[PDB]
Amino acid sequence: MALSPEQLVLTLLEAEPPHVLISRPSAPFTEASMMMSLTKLADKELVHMISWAKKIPGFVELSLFDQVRLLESCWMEVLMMGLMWRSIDHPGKLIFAPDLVLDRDEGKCVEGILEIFDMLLATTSRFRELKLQHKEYLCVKAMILLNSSMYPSSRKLAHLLNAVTDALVWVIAKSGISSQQQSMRLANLLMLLSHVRHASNKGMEHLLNMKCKNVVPVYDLLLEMLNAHVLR
Amino acid sequence: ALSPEQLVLTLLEAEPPHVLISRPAPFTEASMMMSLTKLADKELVHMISWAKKIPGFVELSLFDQVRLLESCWMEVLMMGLMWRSIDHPGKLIFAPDLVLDRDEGKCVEGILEIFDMLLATTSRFRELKLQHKEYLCVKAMILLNSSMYDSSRKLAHLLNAVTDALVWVIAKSGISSQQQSMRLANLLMLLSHVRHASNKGMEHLLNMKCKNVVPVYDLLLEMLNAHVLR
Ligand SMILES: C[C@]12CC[C@@H]3c4ccc(O)cc4CC[C@H]3[C@@H]1CC[C@@H]2O
Numbered sequence: 001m002a003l004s005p006e007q008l009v010l011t012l013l014e015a016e017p018p019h020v021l022i023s024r025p026s027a028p029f030t031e032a033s034m035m036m037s038l039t040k041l042a043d044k045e046l047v048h049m050i051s052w053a054k055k056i057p058g059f060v061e062l063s064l065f066d067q068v069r070l071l072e073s074c075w076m077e078v079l080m081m082g083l084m085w086r087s088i089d090h091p092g093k094l095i096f097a098p099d100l101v102l103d104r105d106e107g108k109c110v111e112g113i114l115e116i117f118d119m120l121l122a123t124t125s126r127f128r129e130l131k132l133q134h135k136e137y138l139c140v141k142a143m144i145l146l147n148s149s150m151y152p153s154s155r156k157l158a159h160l161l162n163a164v165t166d167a168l169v170w171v172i173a174k175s176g177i178s179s180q181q182q183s184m185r186l187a188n189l190l191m192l193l194s195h196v197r198h199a200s201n202k203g204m205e206h207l208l209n210m211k212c213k214n215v216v217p218v219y220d221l222l223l224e225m226l227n228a229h230v231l232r
Numbered sequence: 233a234l235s236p237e238q239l240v241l242t243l244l245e246a247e248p249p250h251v252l253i254s255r256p257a258p259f260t261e262a263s264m265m266m267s268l269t270k271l272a273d274k275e276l277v278h279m280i281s282w283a284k285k286i287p288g289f290v291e292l293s294l295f296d297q298v299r300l301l302e303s304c305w306m307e308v309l310m311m312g313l314m315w316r317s318i319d320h321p322g323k324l325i326f327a328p329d330l331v332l333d334r335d336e337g338k339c340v341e342g343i344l345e346i347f348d349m350l351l352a353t354t355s356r357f358r359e360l361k362l363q364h365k366e367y368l369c370v371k372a373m374i375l376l377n378s379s380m381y382d383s384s385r386k387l388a389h390l391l392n393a394v395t396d397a398l399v400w401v402i403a404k405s406g407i408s409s410q411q412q413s414m415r416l417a418n419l420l421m422l423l424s425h426v427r428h429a430s431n432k433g434m435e436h437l438l439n440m441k442c443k444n445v446v447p448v449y450d451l452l453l454e455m456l457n458a459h460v461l462r
């Protein structure tokens with residue numbers, strides 16, 4: 001009942017994290033400062049991602065190992081999915097934050113992010129061509145959280161993933177297009193999940209290179225967030 | 233235009249032949265990495281012929297063909313491994329004369345992680361009871377969906393054709409309309425898991441190159457340089 005399509009979307013809509021306000025530094029972007037304004041923004045969003053995930057129906061009913069498994073495997077993917085939704089209507093730019101809008105070429109000051117920036121902009125453009133809705137994005141983001149763990153309590157997670165899947169089918173069904181067009185959109189939407197995951201792995205492979213070059217302190221930003229923040 | 237009933241039949245005849253490695257002496261870190269990279273090299277030769285037999289692939293520009301192959305070749309090798317191993321838990325059937333149990337990875341540093349990813353994704357396909365026709369569509373979809381960025385419009389048509397074929401395959405099973413969307417969604421979500429395995433299994437091959445366990449990293453490029461045209 002709480003997993004009902006119309007209801008689950010409303011729950012997902014009310015679980016959306018608040019906008020994080022980070023601004024540009026006064027000095028021009030250097031490799032150290034840009035890699036710092038991005039990991040600072042990521043740290044703040046990861047605080048809200050825990051509250052968002054805990055607010056998806058059934059997530060708190062999962063085991064503690066499964067919750068950590070899902071978050072550890074999806075946090076970078078969820079950060080990128082939210083970035084592409086904020087940049088969906090601004091071609092050539094990445095809307096990390098309202099007061100932090102980065103043009104593409106601005107990534108020329110840090111080694112190797114332009115490859116990652118082009119991946120994000122390309123996937124964002126494909127979501128623009130598909131005319132991604134707001135409720136498709138809410139389902140897709142929740143699906144990323146529930147599906148990104150590989151597991152290389154199990155019955156409850158499978159039920160939630162199917163529930164969010166029913167919600168995405170229900171949102172597409174509201175478009176009124178043909179049954180064949182409804183399957184095509186569902187397939188075009190989910191085939192992009194591979195491109196988001198690819199960006200998740202590549203943009204994260206780049207973050208490991210920055211820790212080895214002593215540009216950033218640590219690599220696992222979720223682990224860093226949890227270690228530094230305190231429980232109320 | 234090919235019907236979905238006719239496209240699936242074309243993918244069937246495009247299936248590569250089986251390859252043997254026959255080897256070796258117990259397994260070392262270098263000997264196992266030698267056998268797996270040597271197996272991939274032999275398979276990559278047949279992957280070129282397989283891709284060119286997918287309807288419309290030869291009509292794509294030469295740039296597009298190389299772009300798709302460079303992006304998906306590890307995924308295609310891994311998807312083919314998963315299909316061969318779908319009915320044998322705990323085992324990876326790389327080639328006929330090379331069936332590895334899960335624990336046999338311990339000899340190569342970091343390979344157990346990749347093996348468990350391949351086995352777990354293989355288990356999801358087994359629990360889904362992946363059909364032959366579904367496998368043929370999915371593997372073709374991996375080639376045509378791997379790229380990120382007149383020939384571009386033709387590629388979107390080919391991916392639509394293979395996707396329609398998959399939807400047709402699911403529809404002909406006679407399951408509920410809600411079950412048809414559920415099955416299509418579960419299949420395509422596993423594409424992300426194939427990509428994660430491809431990215432991590434390739435991150436691992438790069439570490440084996442810096443460790444000087446294997447000579448080359450881009451096995452597709454090494455194949456095209458060494459093999460000659462007829
Ligand atoms: C992970 C990186 C820093 C954090 C960046 C970020 C930071 C916040 C956010 O909401 C999204 C993204 C996506 C791109 C990420 C970058 C890609 C490479 C870089 O290391």
Ligand SMILES: C[C@]12CC[C@@H]3c4ccc(O)cc4CC[C@H]3[C@@H]1CC[C@@H]2O
Nearest residue numbers: 268271272309310313346433436437
């Ligand atoms: C890419 C690796 C070598 C080649 C292996 C292979 C080789 C042939 C094949 O058909 C499939 C696979 C998947 C696993 C691959 C391995 C995973 C890690 C290792 O580097």
